[PDB]
Design a protein around this ligand. Sequence first.
Ligand SMILES: Nc1ncnc2c1ncn2[C@@H]1O[C@H](COP(=O)(O)OP(=O)(O)OP(=O)(O)O)[C@@H](O)[C@H]1O
Ligand SMILES: Nc1ncnc2c1ncn2[C@@H]1O[C@H](COP(=O)(O)OP(=O)(O)OP(=O)(O)O)[C@@H](O)[C@H]1O
Ligand SMILES: [Mg+2]
Ligand SMILES: [Mg+2]
Lengths: 258, 258, 297, 297, 7, 7
Amino acid sequence: VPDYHEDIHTYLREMEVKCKPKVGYMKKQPDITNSMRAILVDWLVEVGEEYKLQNETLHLAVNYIDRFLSSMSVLRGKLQLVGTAAMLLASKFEEIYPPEVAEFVYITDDTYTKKQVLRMEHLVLKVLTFDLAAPTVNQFLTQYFLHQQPANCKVESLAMFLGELSLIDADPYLKYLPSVIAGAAFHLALYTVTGQSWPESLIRKTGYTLESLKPCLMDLHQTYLKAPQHAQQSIREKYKNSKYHGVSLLNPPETLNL
Amino acid sequence: VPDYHEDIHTYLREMEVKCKPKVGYMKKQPDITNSMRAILVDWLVEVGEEYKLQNETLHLAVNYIDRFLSSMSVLRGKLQLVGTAAMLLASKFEEIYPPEVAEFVYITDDTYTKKQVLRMEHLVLKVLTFDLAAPTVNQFLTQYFLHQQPANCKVESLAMFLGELSLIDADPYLKYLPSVIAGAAFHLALYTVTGQSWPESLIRKTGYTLESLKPCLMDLHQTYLKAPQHAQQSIREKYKNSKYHGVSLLNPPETLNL
Amino acid sequence: SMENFQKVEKIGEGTYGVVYKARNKLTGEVVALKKIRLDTETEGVPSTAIREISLLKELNHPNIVKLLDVIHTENKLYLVFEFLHQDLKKFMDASALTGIPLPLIKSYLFQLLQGLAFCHSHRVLHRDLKPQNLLINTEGAIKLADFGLARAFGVPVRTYTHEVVTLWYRAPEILLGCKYYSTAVDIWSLGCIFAEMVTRRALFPGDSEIDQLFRIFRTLGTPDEVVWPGVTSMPDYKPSFPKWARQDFSKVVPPLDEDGRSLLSQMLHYDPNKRISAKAALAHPFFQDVTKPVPHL
Amino acid sequence: SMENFQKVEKIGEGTYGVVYKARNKLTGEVVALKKIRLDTETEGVPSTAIREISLLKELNHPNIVKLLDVIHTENKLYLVFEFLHQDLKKFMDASALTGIPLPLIKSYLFQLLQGLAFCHSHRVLHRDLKPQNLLINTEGAIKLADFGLARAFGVPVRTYTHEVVTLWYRAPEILLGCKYYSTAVDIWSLGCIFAEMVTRRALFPGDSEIDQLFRIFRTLGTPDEVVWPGVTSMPDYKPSFPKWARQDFSKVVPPLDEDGRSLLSQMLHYDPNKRISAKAALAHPFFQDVTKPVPHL
Amino acid sequence: HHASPRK
Amino acid sequence: HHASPRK
Ligand SMILES: Nc1ncnc2c1ncn2[C@@H]1O[C@H](COP(=O)(O)OP(=O)(O)OP(=O)(O)O)[C@@H](O)[C@H]1O
Ligand SMILES: Nc1ncnc2c1ncn2[C@@H]1O[C@H](COP(=O)(O)OP(=O)(O)OP(=O)(O)O)[C@@H](O)[C@H]1O
Ligand SMILES: [Mg+2]
Ligand SMILES: [Mg+2]
């Protein structure tokens, strides 16, 4: 059903530029670092797995955390509270059955009360002005997936595993829009599994060439080669499963020949 | 003291584009028209005269009326209330001694209570998000007046008179930015009193040629020629005074030779 | 907070509270206030409200009600909307003797299709289109409203909530339990409403899901693999379903012309992949002469 | 609406209410809450608050305190600011034994000049610069604050309010009643603060307006038509004023080097048309070696 | 008539 | 010391 596809694609291209976090925000946080953010996102990866939430819910929650931290200074003892209210809000926007609030409170181990979570939910909605329908790497991957000749299950899981790895590291991934990370991820996955490249039909559909993708690809290639030694490991653990064709066990290409 | 002059000019050129009313708003007002807004602005012109307020105050009050009506549908019985709260706020921003609120209530003849004025004041501040420092035709005129070879009193009063006439008629003047109406007004005033034209030094300072001003200048020439018959006459009355060199009595040029 | 609004009358009622007609005390604006009750030691803001408000903020179109403001207090949440004369169900009920004039039926459908095609182009499924969720004003406009069941959808879609759309307007791919549904379910709802505006009564008034399916089968013919490939493998399909033959639309919607019949059958096509889109529906010859009549209120 | 702030302590008081040090209960952020009392059957929002809020919203610069939020209730108005360790007067008081280190005085002045030159470039006159209205953080930054006397000015300026600037920092063109004043009054206030940081005491501590003027005339010389054309025709000038001779800056600001004395005398030039601008001051050779030391707090 | 289906 | 001048 392609009728609306191109319109939606254009509209997402426009909303990603407007839903985008401000790039150097961490530099203005007096108390939190990219590392503490990395530990937080790795934790929501696990919360997602525990509750069986969509990958899309995770990527929304990340987008809401980086937009909130874009205008609100937060002390370290409260970062998990922003992150839990964001996971709850993303669950309410996207899941058919979101976890209940008392479950969100249990997964923090009573670090916060129910009342804190509920008040942080109201502050996140106000700071984001309720604008929750954001474009994610996942939304662009799934559209890119329709141009594969023929469909390859392994390429898809791996493009997903890469797009998810990007969420952990604000530096360098806050520099890149969702659609560009998705394109770098889909090219790297394809290249790794079948030796093919970012397709000519995606070039026309996104205007992106392997040259405009290069900076993001070089970063994502170094993240993929160093994934086994990163401090956060829940995404590699999750992509070992058979649901994902165990793609996090594949070995990354040594070079991209770019 | 020209030290800051160019920076200030550049920054006003940028804020006028951001403080600009939406051009077709009246078309979406179910109950008020350009003619009701006309009567409103003409009345503020008188309120201004009664209280000896600055022309700038008037010009700010009009920008706040058109910004508020740009996102708030208003019933005709409340339009004066929006206008009184806006003249109150402009007075508080710009004057050394703004009229007191009880005086604003008296000039409406008890059409509203004090409490309505005070509450409409808080609604106007929120709708405008407290962004009150808007660029006005008056702020660009005064800058344009430093390029006159030598200073002419009469030209200055006449450019002011014309910039004020443009406040009455949302159609056509909401199409033009403050800096453009000011240019058209200064060129028309100059041409009328001495036969000179928009100067080469203003062309370079604003980047506006006599051609880019033409559409605004044709409209302003028609408004000048038709001023003695317009339904609203407070500005012509006000510019009869010796403070203004009686310029509204001068006869407009028959043609602009454009 | 709600200081500035004066409640005038109850306009409707829903799930999370009440719906009032109100007026802004300072500007005179007439509005519809939709109260969503919260609390605490509950689930916080209702996911239906979080979707309604964020989807509405992205749906700026003449045929989509306008959200004017959101008053998010500590105790309650109020959605502030533009107020329109009434919903299409009330207008229909008031016109059951006369009927809605032909040109206004065509104008209403063309506008419903333009707001629906804008929704779909912004990746939003409505999923609750019925006459009481559509709003008309005194000058001839009609608008989509009640975005309380809506959702942002993805390309290609995943599985979404099964309990969607008010029974009478529910698509057969939902009733048969299909793993996937998409924009075709709103089109089906609009086909139902177009017929209802024409005949003055619900096209498929079921009283339960099997009854709803059977009303559809009796009018359009029980679908088989030729009309809808995959039908007989659907989760709730049963090969013992009675096999009825399709009824001629001259009996189904007697007052409708050839062009209107053609458009209605493309909106009610069994197979969702073949059902017409809102955007192609906008180019059908039924709309070549469309005008904007004013309702008789 | 203030439900998320916990008041921690009184930090200052003033005109329309007070200032408290508070914390955001949900994020931990530490803020400064400036309460402006309203009422009703009064004048509505105070013009000083309307100006402070709207000029602050257009002044986004590292050396200008940031306004984080405005909580505009029916009863009260709260301005919510980022919290900084303390104001420059409290820092000075705590450093009267040591003195502020030379590099930190240069860094503070360079920063105040960059905040002031941004204000002036955005057509804003601060008009109340003094050490208690300047804020420092623990890392070496200093910021302009208290915009409660500020005003957007025009090119060329018109006459503005005569009662502006705290007495000790007030420029002689105001004291002599000039019809016009502009950005040079803020430069004067800064040269006075520059000297004060250097010597550890107010440069011109008058106890009335005539005394303020005579303290200025005894240091810099009683101005005449050669140093400031038009002085003797100013509304409050009196030809019977004592004629004092200018004192050598080695006696006026002993610890200051040649470059610092050159900069200070251009900031204290009598003729406002000749007083150095903030922007030309940023280029003086006194700043060639500027660094950003951290205060000893 | 039926009510709108309920989350 | 003096207070800031008052509107
Ligand atoms: N903006 C409006 N102008 C006029 N009437 C309106 C407006 N909004 C809602 N209504 C009325 O209020 C009724 C209830 O509104 P709405 O459909 O949005 O919420 P709801 O109760 O959740 O509806 P439903 O029960 O179908 O889920 C509408 O059917 C309509 O009659
Ligand atoms: N953001 C802040 N961080 C830390 N202390 C602050 C902050 N804002 C204000 N203060 C303290 O509060 C005092 C009073 O604040 P402010 O100067 O803004 O208001 P004011 O009382 O109106 O001052 P003034 O009386 O000079 O007009 C400041 O001198 C400073 O000591
Ligand atoms: Mg409804
Ligand atoms: Mg102060």
